[PDB]
Subunit: 397 residues, 3 copies
């Protein structure tokens, strides 16, 4: 076939052309037709991303945890989890500071229960029709168990364990190649998605919301620079050299709006920059789904936007409430386009702002449009976080 | 045990005796009692057919697609799919012609969205509690992927892929033997089913609906003769010799009301008449669930019946609407007794006739009774279609 | 780590201390605080028990049935099933006799369809989000099939079958070690559970309900003694010697409120007392979920309690109705804490007493409290039943 260029170049070309077409059709009546024809081609991409998420989450964990002995798992797991949560908190507070400084959108005027829920009442049921988190719990559990079995004395169960582990590993590999296949469609789909967005955008009225956009972007960039360079220089990594390798991943994640299709590319990058394989094999897929701190910063800023549009004022307690809820709601989120808004609703209802009130609903719609733009940034920052965290831990050894 | 005859003979005997008993009890008060005692024995058969459908659909596809290299898959797949759809359209239009000629039942007076839906938003979720079509998509996908893995260079993933494929294949084989087991119950169950039908039937009032029945049967027989003999003689097969082998399958499918229990018998027939194994292994289970064109012709005729009972008149556009909708709704259907009526409702609501209106509901009930008779014919024609299509393609090589 | 004692000792210590703390805090205002802090630690145990139930039911059956040839399966299966049902009936009638004698709680004033339901309309769907019983049916089916395949002549399918069976067996083993892991948490959780119960209990008012409690306990103890000693002496087992081994299992089952975590300990006990392995491997996990006759006796007694609180009088027909319904509803039940009450509702609605009427609802709440106490007894008697039944059958050979 004739599509033979390398992937990222293809996607970039598609993005560019889609933006141009969206603008020039925006001026004229064709701005309507594009909805009917183009959007279907876009949605077909989105769905293909959701499909591949669920199998890669379960399987890849099970293999990863199985490969490592339990003690080493203890050490690496605690280090990494501590780092993940701390950085997420740092990110959302940085976002709140940005919101306070810019003050966007002024316009015109069970807390234990959720921590208990993480344990699956039923594994198959939660796996098929339920949530991400419980599958993570069950996967790690099963991996540890299979390890102990492989040490066992009796050959019968030893052979059984080996073959089970091999089956699950096979499922994982297959899903990765499926991802490559989807990326070939990705240029066409990206073209469609961005074209519809640009055609709906009216620039100068969007200019008011652009103050929101500026707050968000400045927050994201500040996070990258400040946090990751400070940490890398404390532990002793040359940041520009790290970013050199990261750049491929970050580009792929910026143009595509998946935190998950990026995963195999990320693992290639990890193999290139010479890291102990098992460590990244375990930590990276866990990170792909926990390290959505960019989405956390966004959620904080948007919570402040909606609050400012409603006109409320927040105590220290309510701002702490935002912070904690945002961490947990980010952990609950799933790695696919647009999802961050659906979880933003969770945190809003936590703080006490109803999604069904029409005034705030209108403001929310305004934000939902620009969410498509902000999504690209969020994804870039997420993959950055993954790579940095793994590199740090590996440097400690 | 004492049931030792060959299967088809057993089923035929059961059918005959059940019909006789239904008639002679129909004359007298016992016509009531049979509902309570006999129907339960019948339902227990129906359920056993549904159970075995879902696993054989998924598994058998995955193995089939895995066995064949991708290029050959391209060629055979496109040929077969084109043929399937074309013949389905031919069938439903033939049915509309029959309806126009006989004019039965006069009595007394998202289109893209569904094509998008075929992609599963979640594979496990759609597999367990969702539809047929998406499992087909995902199965084919997974098979292709496993093929590429088996070519891969690295032994670890090679062994993993092999073992996964073997597991799935094992599930398939087991389900086939389960089918044989169910067929042993089938004589008893067929006896029950047909007895209840005959006991409910009042012959002379059914005589008016018998004009509907005659239209349907004449349509089916005309389809067999005209379409399949024309095609076979174009490509160069002796039709009576083909039908000789087909006869076993067609009988088994006529007496039993499953398009799926017939599948193993069909594959035996394919092995007998000497066909390239991989080709039929892939094309036949796909055909078992797509080639329900007999049900398509029925759905067209019944749509015209309901329309004539409502008294409406149909433009060229609405008749085209019937045709297209019928193709897609047949593809959505599942291979078990009585299902065709449930999908008939889909096409009716598509054309714009509400199922909840009482007048048309009464007419629909009249048709639902005779649906049990017509089901047998539909199934015969379906298996005919499967065998013919595979034979044609194999003849082209 | 510092928790190094043997399990049962740990659990006993936890139970004791939790009871004491519950009482002494009960006197004072702290009786309130314990709800908030302690209950969460308790629930986290309960959920972990539910999780592990569903996988061990399916997998362990499939392996068991696969190991044994079909003929031997016929013999052992019929013997065991007959025994299970007969003893369940004996138990519930004994309970009704006890209820008549004590007359507790006087206070102040589809039957075929469910038997048909056992067959799964969809296997994956019933497995993930549906019930226990259909998974049992499908599991046994699949096991038999895999056996025949292993006899088959063709090596390809032979290898496939072997590998499938090995996968499923691996899942089983892993789940057993998970059970051990949960038991380490069990002491802490038991402490919490019992403490909350004791803190809610007001002793002297509970003294009236204690007449209910006495009826129940006397019934249970009478069942053990009379039934099992009569049977053991008929077939020729020294009862005290049997109970010697049983004692470990019965203690573990009394302190823990799971009929399922006890299963591996039970199988250890079976290996100790020298029984043919395959026989107990099949019969014991089937028994773990069918032999809940202690819960059956309780359900009968509680049905009479609620009836006496409503003030109704029961014919011979209605008492037979209770008996039959109780057998089936016990079979439907699942092996986890508190479940017996939820199925008690099924039998109540069967007899015709509505759960939504407030008077009987109040009485039901009174019983629901003490259900936590009675649960321990039920579980002890259940594991006794399992061991005795297997021992009897093995003695016949
Ligand atoms: N869906 C994005 C992040 C987000 O916007 O929530 C990803 O994980 O790839
Ligand atoms: N259920 C039939 C066809 C139909 O009547 O819809 C079959 O596929 O066997
Ligand atoms: N849930 C208990 C019995 C019951 O109380 O229903 C068990 O099976 O362990």
């Amino acid at each position: 076939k004739y599509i033979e260029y390398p992937v990222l170049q293809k996607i970039l070309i598609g993005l560019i052309l889609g933006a141009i077409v969206g603008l020039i059709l925006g001026h004229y009546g064709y701005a309507d037709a594009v909805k009917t024809y183009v959007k279907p081609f876009g949605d077909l991409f989105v769905r293909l991303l959701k499909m591949l998420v669920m199998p890669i989450v379960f399987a890849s964990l099970v293999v990863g945890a199985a490969s490592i002995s339990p003690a080493r798992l203890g050490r690496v797991g605690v280090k990494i989890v501590v780092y993940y949560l701390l950085t997420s908190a740092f990110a959302v507070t940085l976002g709140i500071i940005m919101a306070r400084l810019f003050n966007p959108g002024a316009g015109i005027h069970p807390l234990v229960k959720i921590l208990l829920d993480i344990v699956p009442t039923n594994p198959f049921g939660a796996l098929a029709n339920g949530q991400v988190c419980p599958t993570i719990f069950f996967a790690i559990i099963l991996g540890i168990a299979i390890t102990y079995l492989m040490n066992s004395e009796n050959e019968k169960v030893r052979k059984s364990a080996e073959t089970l582990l091999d089956a699950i590993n096979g499922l994982a590999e297959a899903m990765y190649k499926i991802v490559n296949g989807v990326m070939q469609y990705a240029p066409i789909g990206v073209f469609a998605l961005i074209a519809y967005v640009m055609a709906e955008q009216g620039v100068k009225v969007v200019g008011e919301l652009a103050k929101v956009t500026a707050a968000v972007y400045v927050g994201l960039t500040l996070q990258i620079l400040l946090v990751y360079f400070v940490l890398l220089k404390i532990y002793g990594i040359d940041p520009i050299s790290f970013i050199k390798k990261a750049k491929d991943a970050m580009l792929t994640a910026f143009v595509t709006r998946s935190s998950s299709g990026t995963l195999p590319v990320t693992m290639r990058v990890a193999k290139e920059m010479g890291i102990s394989e098992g460590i990244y094999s375990f930590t990276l897929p866990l990170g792909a789904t926990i390290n959505m701190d960019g989405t956390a910063l966004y959620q904080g800023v948007s919570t402040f936007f909606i609050a400012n549009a409603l006109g409320s004022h927040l105590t220290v307690g309510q701002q702490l409430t935002i912070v904690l809820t945002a961490v947990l709601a980010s952990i609950c989120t799933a790695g696919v386009p647009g999802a961050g808004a659906i979880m933003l609703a969770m945190v809003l209802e936590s703080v006490g702002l109803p999604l069904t009130d029409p005034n705030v609903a209108a403001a929310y719609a305004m934000i939902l449009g620009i969410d498509a733009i902000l999504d690209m940034g969020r994804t870039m920052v997420n993959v950055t976080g993954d790579l940095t965290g793994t590199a740090i831990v590996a440097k400690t050894e």
